[PDB]
Design a protein around this ligand. Structure first.
Ligand SMILES: [Zn+2]
Lengths: 119, 119
């Protein structure tokens, strides 16, 4: 559920919007390529691998799967009422949001020329 | 797959590297949201939805799936030798590539600030 992932980022980095991560580095946003360029970006790359794994699960659509979780005072928790797919995906997003709130945001890395930076 | 899809783009748009379509408008390359900015960006939207419709099939992942296609002269063709998934993903790419050949390319609409332009 691409939407729930947005709520998570807010639940940990209230000072920003997912848009700030929508186009950052070589891997944040969606399709990755090249060298991570950054710890924050490295987070996004890992987030992809995570989805690639979760996608091995039968009919698991990471982007559209609505999982169950709760954000309480900055804390992210994936609840148990999820099944294999929802559980896996929830964890991916969950770990990304933490990785996000932990890495520094380099404005020079927003909107770069993938053509001359991610080869 | 992607290598196939981008080989298609090289077929109908020889005077342009596929990277030019990796970060165009609000829908080309990246995940996609907001309103298209031109015919080209719109092409990508349709490609997005096409793929999401290709996921409706069990174990069908457009990005990783291999299909059989031919690019001869400037003509694209998806071979009959294709099961359901491949047959649909291919058709998606075929239509996308053809759409790329006709749509005008606008540089002002390349690597734009998403947060301000899409919504
Ligand atoms: Zn960009």
């Amino acid at each position: 559920n691409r939407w729930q992932f947005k709520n998570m980022i807010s639940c940990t980095v209230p000072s920003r919007s997912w848009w700030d991560f929508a186009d950052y580095g070589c891997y944040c946003g969606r399709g990755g390529s090249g060298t991570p360029v950054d710890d924050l970006d490295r987070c996004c790359q890992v987030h992809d691998n995570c989805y690639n794994e979760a996608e091995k699960i039968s009919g698991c659509n990471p982007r559209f799967r609505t999982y169950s979780y709760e954000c309480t005072a900055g804390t992210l928790t994936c609840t148990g009422r999820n099944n294999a797919c929802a559980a896996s995906v929830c964890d991916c997003d969950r770990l990304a949001a933490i990785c996000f709130a932990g890495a520094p945001y380099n404005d020079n890395n927003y909107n770069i020329d993938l053509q001359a930076r991610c080869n | 797959n992607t290598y196939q899809f981008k080989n298609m783009i090289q077929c109908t748009v020889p005077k342009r590297s596929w990277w030019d379509f990796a970060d165009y408008g609000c829908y080309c390359g990246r995940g996609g949201s907001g309103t298209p900015i031109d015919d080209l960006d719109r092409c990508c939207q349709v490609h997005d939805n096409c793929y999401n419709s290709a996921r409706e099939q069990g174990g069908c992942r457009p990005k990783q799936k291999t299909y059989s296609y031919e690019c001869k002269a400037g003509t694209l063709s998806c071979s009959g030798s294709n099961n359901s998934c491949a047959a649909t993903v291919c058709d998606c790419d075929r239509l996308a590539a053809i759409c790329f050949a006709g749509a005008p390319y606008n540089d002002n609409n390349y690597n734009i600030d998403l947060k301000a332009r899409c919504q």
